[PDB]
Design a protein around this ligand. Structure first.
Ligand code: VX0
Ligand code: VX0
Ligand code: VX0
Ligand code: VX0
Ligand code: VX0
Ligand code: VX0
Lengths: 5, 141, 155, 148, 141, 142, 150
């Protein structure tokens, strides 16, 4: 996963 | 290693230490706030955000620290020595976790940029001698 | 509040505790490995991943624990009470941090699903009585970046 | 030579002294503010502004004054004389650097012309008997070019 | 905070220190020179340049140090004690300020790159044992 | 100056210190290997490579250190100090040179990248409790 | 093995020994010079040159030597024997490092061929009895032709 915040 | 817990959130230990010790709520009040506001998210199988990942660990680390400190406190038989532990915790790791829990709870509630600008405003305000200090302290919103 | 540090990572305290307590490296050895493999990432201004964020706190929390434990050691009169602190952290909290540091360091190196599969495999292998135990223990191994299908497709 | 540190900044020692002594933060609080707001600028290889250049020197100068005052205090035989040195510093050179550090930090933070106007406003406010003094003191609201 | 007063002028404390202490003029002689060469600019209500601004502070700072040492000196009965103060300011802060004032005064007369080139030339020259040392020392132009 | 002898070769002191101290051969065994593998190159008038240049200096530095340490131990007849200098050489400077000699010797044989992968692999393997430790240690190959 | 530290640089120990032991600065002065002149390059992740690689090692070896010598002196309490290590360093290892530091530091500034011609000129000059010795010592460094090719 490529985690966006 | 030299890890600063604030650095991946755009702050630093030195910056959080610009707020005076008595600015922060107690650790108990911060933990009651994290629960009242974020319990469901903190307990979920979702990461939610990097602040939630950090907050989760800090809450658990504080429980570990308190278990240890309680174990020492209760097994001491001298009120002087018990007071020395409490004082040492309140001065050192208690202040650290009040800074860190306040930071993550306030970032999640008001936003990181708002929190950082506020932090520096308050720090300036509180250092101003009372005769010249603005009547209204800065507010987060 | 009831927070499981592994829940957001797809695992649970009960699952990590399926590995025997003596499987895990020491904390010191885990911390050396985190540095050797991930120092630049752990120290950088970037989140990098939830594992990195959690690993950062775990490392600092161990240092908090050790600072407090050492300061308490420094105030004790009795030599036997110092060695009861040592036993105290290394029984109660040492195991818990060895699990957590191993988990994030290994997930960072091999991936969550590889690690959880290996974990239940090793747990079954080590509970097998040695006379019945298979000779080759499970091991974590890195997945290739390019499938064999992909290399053959471009021949 | 007769150099007034404020003159290139459009002020004078006489004008800063129009503020009462207990207006200014402590030197320790001013040095933590300079760090919290400007540390990266203060430590860079860029001039940034004439306030930065002055603040860099003033911070290092206070460091020199403290080293000197500490060596004096260490080497005095009388504990009462150590107190006199501390008192003398706070009433004199300490007040001077509270003024100076406050000035440069406030000019960076709020604007130099704003600070100069504010100074005269506050000195007038605080000299007013409290029965006539307006309830709210004046307050201020939160890279430039500079001519030689 | 870790501030190096030379860094905004392209140099460092370590570099100035490469010159030996007896290379620099005396503080009194450096303040006479600042006055003879630069007084009107130093005294004017204009910035002039970053070197002027720094030089203005260094001069005043030395006055501060000297005012404090003198006030101490006049409240000391023993002439040997005033001597130990005199020796001390010249030993410690004296060198620091001879470096700084020399640097600003020379940069204003001969320019930064000329001064830095010359500085390492002389530092190399003077570390050469005298039997091998070239006759012409480097000079500024 | 703070110089890290490994930096220009893509490594650090901290990284080499990830191998346990008893991983490395004796300095004497690394010196005999450097001679068996590279004596002709080390003694020639050509640079050969930065690793050769660095290895040449470390060999000679060890020579200077032992020359100084023997003169100390030999002018001290008391066995306590004669043996205390050996202990200090073993615990301190010896380990530094075993690291550095092994680094350069292995790099000349297998290359920097193969050596650094190996180092980290072995550093993890040897920290693994024997019950879980994979049967075959990593090695250096091709 | 028999390694000459100067051989890969086109010199030899015997030739550096042609300069007298009081031609060279102290090791301290050569180290402060190496820093003032080459610090950035010495501390960089780039090889830069074989002189930089070798100079890097010598700096650190001097560190090793002085740390060993200090720990010995720290654990010698008799006033006489602490001076014994200083003298030994001064007489033996210090001169070798002063040669080597000077060689690399000068080679990086002026070039091998310049340094070696200088070295031999100076060793001749200083051996010359003062009555006959030229006034100016050698130093480390056409009009018609330059104008002809304008
Ligand atoms: C940041 C300042 C001040 C300095 N405040 C805090 O720090 N509150 C705080 C208290 C906690 F218990 C806690 F866990 C926490 F993280 C922060 C309280 C505050 C507000 N609001 C918004 C609604 C109610 C309120 O007071 C606005 N601006 N401000
Ligand atoms: C200038 C007056 C008053 C007189 N204030 C100061 O002088 N603050 C001050 C404190 C320092 F620590 C310091 F280093 C400094 F240079 C100035 C404080 C102030 C503000 N603000 C803006 C955000 C919070 C606040 O209080 C506005 N108007 N005012
Ligand atoms: C830098 C060197 C040398 C080492 N000199 C100094 O440092 N002079 C110096 C003396 C001061 F009193 C002072 F305050 C200051 F900043 C510098 C003197 C000098 C000259 N010239 C030019 C005109 C006359 C002269 O002597 C040229 N090159 N050189
Ligand atoms: C080789 C001779 C002489 C014999 N000189 C040295 O050996 N200088 C020396 C000093 C050190 F501190 C050091 F670390 C080093 F490597 C060399 C000094 C020198 C120069 N120059 C050039 C600018 C200033 C100067 O004097 C020219 N020719 N010569
Ligand atoms: C790096 C590991 C292991 C950890 N080995 C060493 O470190 N050998 C070592 C011994 C020395 F004396 C020396 F000077 C040196 F630089 C290295 C030995 C080794 C081999 N090979 C290849 C042929 C025979 C062999 O055993 C392959 N992989 N490995
Ligand atoms: C999970 C098992 C076993 C059970 N191993 C561990 O747990 N290693 C370990 C050691 C640490 F010091 C540490 F901090 C950590 F997180 C993990 C070691 C291991 C490997 N590899 C890969 C290269 C070398 C090696 O042995 C593969 N599979 N396995």
């Amino acid at each position: 996963n490529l985690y966006f915040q």
